[PDB]
Amino acid sequence: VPDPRGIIINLDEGELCLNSAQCKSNCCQHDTILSLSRCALKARENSECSAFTLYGVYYKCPCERGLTCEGDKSLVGSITNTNFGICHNVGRS
């Protein structure tokens, strides 16, 4: 009720962003480690996600409401600061 974060504004996927607070769907999508951050789509079943949302730019955007990220490492990028996984409809266990 008293100000719960409130920083996400109004941009589409496919436009240049600084943090994840720029786009309507809060997914500012990074290259792998250095920079190049443009907004993208949130993941669905059988797609490569990172894990969940923090407050910042994402190497591979997380799974939508209902699906979980299954952390198999998945090195589609060479060098990063995360673990990548496949989106599935199971809810952690």
Please report, for the chain, the start and end positions of each structural domain, with discontinuous segments joined by +: 1-93
Whether the Cβ atoms of residue 46 and residue 87 lie closer than 8 Å to each other: yes
CATH code of 1-93, in short, is 2.10.80.10
Whether the Cβ atoms of residue 7 and residue 23 lie closer than 8 Å to each other: no
Candidates 25, 32, 31; CA nearest to 82 is: 32
DSSP string covering the chain:
------------TTSB-SSTTSSSS--EE--SSS---EE-PPB-TTSEE-S---SS-BSS--B-TT-EEEEEE--TTSS-SS-EEEEETT---
Strand 84-88 versus strand 68-73 pairing type = antiparallel
Residue 34 to residues 9, 10, 19, 78: CA-CA distances in angstroms?
A: 25, 25, 14, 12
